[PDB]
Amino acid sequence: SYTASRKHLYVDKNTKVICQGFTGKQGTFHSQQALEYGTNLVGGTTPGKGGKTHLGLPVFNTVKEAKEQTGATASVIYVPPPFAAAAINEAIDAEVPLVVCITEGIPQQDMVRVKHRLLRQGKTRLIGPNCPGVINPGECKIGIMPGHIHKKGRIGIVSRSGTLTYEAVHQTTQVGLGQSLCVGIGGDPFNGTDFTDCLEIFLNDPATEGIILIGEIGGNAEENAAEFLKQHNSGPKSKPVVSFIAGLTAPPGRRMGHAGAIIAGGGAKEKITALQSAGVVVSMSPAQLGTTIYKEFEKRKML
């Protein structure tokens, strides 16, 4: 099933990456930063321009044309929202192991269709859309996150927010713990990877000893992740987990319908205490994530 493709989330320096929307303004930018950081970017694609050379790498028309001809195993997408949903299906059709869609603003209805078939196949793992990406510090960098704050370390990070994710990464590097694998699942409600998928990798990764989960008010993703740790991260090999939820000071939105409440039964107190009940240390200050995970190692004598 689709859960099988979880393993493809853990990129390394052997993953050969390609860029959809290569010649685009963003695809051009973050492709440079990807090559400079040392990521193994082997080319990209732009309809109608297959055959040209961009950034010294080949440009193809389709993903399959780019995949088999370069042995790519990961694809990052910067296609505009109107056609981003299609760019994902092309990668799945090409059976790309890992697809990371950075584009924000894809209609939910489009992603409902993408996710529909995505859950019917186990070859392609999706991250996003509307996410920063995934990065193995020092090894592979697929996304927009700044690579100059990442140190290969012992902490695995999964974040639902965006630029907020960089805080935990930066803070964990300063305290000396570094990061084992940072993953941004994005903000869009229909995405290809949730907290549980990353928690499954972090708990099963020896290099991941501590965990940081960064969520925010809205939905029930934080509660779901809480119940997972309550089942798989309890007892002997209990890996320490830290978290911060943004918006606990935000005001309550202006509603228009009874549907939301009937389905919920949501934010701040709910997510916090629920997360805590699973045994995770919820940092109230967004600036004290690194300091918190650090002392959690000191409290358990893991430094």
């Binding site: 924000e104 965006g162 630029t163 907020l164 903000g187 925010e216 918006g247 000071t249 935000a250 967004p286």
Partner: peptide, 29 residues
């Protein structure tokens, strides 16, 4: 701030320091 989640955390940590945010502008990326 340049990020909804970060911009909210911004309004949060200000509240932690006795301040009251008047609002916030989100740029994204």
């Amino acid at each position: 701030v340049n990020g909804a989640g970060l911009a909210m955390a911004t309004c949060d940590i200000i509240f932690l320091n006795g301040g009251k945010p008047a609002n916030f502008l989100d740029l994204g990326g």
